[PDB]
Design a protein around this ligand. Structure first.
Ligand SMILES: [Cu+2]
Length: 206
C-alpha cells in the first residue's frame, strides 16, 4: 500500500497531504483538490489503496478504461478521484536522471516487490482541464522498467529500499521532453498476491 511522493503523484498532493476534510474547511495546502474529491469524498482517504492484482500496463496492454487508477479494485474497476482532469498541482522537473520515490509506510511490501514501471505522455501531448487521459496519450512502452528481488538487493542498484522510512527509491532516465506532461507509474509485487499500485504524476519538463 503506497504512492509516489517524489515527484509527488496526484494522490500525494490530494490524499497524503491535502485530505477531503481539509478542502471542505478551506484550510487545505492544495485547495485545487476540491475537484478530485467533488464526486468521491470519502475515497480521498484511500489514496494508498489504488490497487489491482495483475501485472499492469506492460503485460495486459492498454486495457483499463481509466489510466491513473487502472480500474482499481478499490473502486470496483471504475473511476478513482485521480482520474479526474482538474487543475492538478504540477512538479517542475528536468529531463535526465530522476529519483521516483514510493512512500510505502501504509503497507510495506519490501520482501516480494517485483517491479517498478513508468510511462510518459508522447511529445504531441496537450493537457486540458476536463479531457481525461487515454492510453494513446502515452508511449506504448515504459521509459523506465526496473526489476527487483529483495533476496539480492545488490543486483538492483536502481532500486533502493529504505526500511526505517518505509520508502522505495527508484532511478529512471526521464527522456527529452518539454512542457506539460504526465508520468504514469506502477509498483508491482510477485506471486502470491501480484498486487500492484498505480499513480499519475503531473510534470512540467525543461
Ligand atoms: Cu499493501
Amino acid at each position: 500500500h503506497g504512492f509516489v511522493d517524489s515527484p509527488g503523484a496526484r494522490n500525494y498532493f490530494c490524499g497524503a497531504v491535502t485530505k477531503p476534510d481539509h478542502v471542505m474547511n478551506g484550510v487545505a495546502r492544495y485547495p485545487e483538490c476540491a475537484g478530485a474529491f467533488a464526486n468521491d469524498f470519502n475515497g480521498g482517504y484511500s489514496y494508498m489503496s489504488v490497487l489491482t492484482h495483475h501485472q499492469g500496463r506492460k503485460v495486459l496492454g492498454p486495457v483499463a478504461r481509466n489510466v491513473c487508477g487502472f480500474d482499481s479494485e478499490t473502486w470496483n474497476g471504475g473511476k478513482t478521484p485521480w482520474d479526474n482532469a482538474i487543475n492538478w498541482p504540477v512538479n517542475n522537473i528536468n529531463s535526465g536522471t530522476l529519483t521516483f520515490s514510493w512512500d510505502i509506510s501504509n503497507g510495506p511490501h519490501f520482501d516480494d516487490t517485483s517491479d517498478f514501471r513508468y510511462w510518459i505522455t508522447k511529445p504531441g501531448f496537450v493537457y486540458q482541464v476536463g479531457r481525461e487521459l487515454t492510453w494513446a496519450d502515452f508511449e506504448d512502452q515504459p521509459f523506465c522498467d526496473l526489476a527487483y528481488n529483495d533476496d539480492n538487493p545488490g543486483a538492483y542498484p536502481n532500486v533502493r529500499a529504505d526500511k526505517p522510512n518505509t520508502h522505495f527509491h527508484t532511478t529512471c532516465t526521464v527522456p527529452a521532453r518539454t512542457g506539460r506532461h504526465v508520468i504514469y507509474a506502477e509498483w508491482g509485487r510477485e506471486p502470491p498476491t501480484y498486487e500492484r499500485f498505480h499513480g499519475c504524476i503531473d510534470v512540467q519538463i525543461h
